[PDB]
Design a protein around this ligand. Structure first.
Ligand code: HEM
Ligand code: HEM
Lengths: 145, 145
């Protein structure tokens, strides 16, 4: 199932993911926080999953939120580095899904991250072409949930 | 405390961490699996914590172990990237400690990773000076458990 979703990651898709990551991943703290705060803004209900982070309205200034945001970017860094080897990408994606499955985060719930990522990409001038590429990467993770 | 331990990362310690990581971090899959296999070999008692991984003796052939090993290296990548800012290093370490605290991994238990790291370092011509540098970094995490 995860292997099938990984099959959608064509040569052109991987190319756009890498080029866009070269910029997005250059500032993990800045963009990581941008993704989370945007998620909470467009889908307030997702905050129910982050009670441990405390006052998320503080954004960057919130140490726990900042810690989470930075760490989130290293999961994406991981995925991006394994793109050329489906076997490694799959094992890393399934490993990643373990904790999210335990948190009872469905594929649909996880997909709510697509909007934030699309917006962050647009702030760096990466159009729909790139947003679609990232939606496909997220789809690989969704297949594991 | 974690804040006092982070202050132990002096200038030369950070430098040695970077220089050694430049090599060790070049092959996250290979070195990551070596670290885990060494841990299970020198400290068989820790295998109980990894029941989900299955037959750990399969090494690289075990998809779950390989996935975990690769992911582990990205946590270290995270720490290394935060060496410039103590505030970020701390929030990232505390974030990382959450799941390990939940698994009831004590500071003493976590410290068993020092042996494996030292051996992997040695296999790449990096001696005691570097093993001690990494022990200090591991100490920051121990302070958070
Ligand atoms: C591409 C998007 C995402 C990435 C790369 C990502 C990455 C991570 C990482 C690396 C962790 C730390 C390791 C762990 O405990 O699993 C984590 C924790 C977590 N994730 Fe995800 N995640 C993503 C999306 C989501 C979404 C959409 C939700 C929920 C709506 C979610 C909820 C959580 C929660 C609740 C935690 C624990 C936070 C804490 O208490 O510190 N994640 N995620
Ligand atoms: C350099 C030290 C270590 C690093 C960088 C590291 C890194 C990680 C990472 C990134 C994860 C995935 C996220 C999470 O679930 O928290 C993880 C999972 C885990 N770690 Fe640690 N860890 C280290 C040492 C240890 C040690 C010494 C133990 C046990 C004595 C331990 C036990 C666990 C367990 C049981 C899991 C879950 C594995 C699974 O079921 O997939 N870790 N660790």
């Amino acid at each position: 199932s995860v292997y099938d979703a990984a099959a959608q990651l064509t040569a052109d898709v991987k190319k756009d993911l890498r080029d866009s990551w070269k910029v997005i991943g250059s500032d993990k703290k800045g963009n990581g926080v941008a993704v989370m705060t945007t998620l909470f803004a467009d889908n307030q209900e997702t905050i129910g999953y982050f009670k441990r982070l405390g006052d998320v309205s503080q954004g960057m200034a919130n140490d726990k939120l900042r810690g989470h945001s930075i760490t989130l970017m290293y999961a994406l860094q991981n995925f991006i580095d394994q793109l050329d080897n489906p076997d490694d990408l799959v094992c890393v994606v399934e490993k990643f899904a373990v904790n999210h499955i335990t948190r009872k985060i469905s594929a649909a719930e996880f997909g709510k991250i697509n909007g934030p990522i699309k917006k962050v990409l647009a702030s760096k001038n990466f159009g729909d072409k790139y947003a679609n590429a990232w939606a496909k990467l997220v789809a690989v993770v969704q297949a594991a949930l």
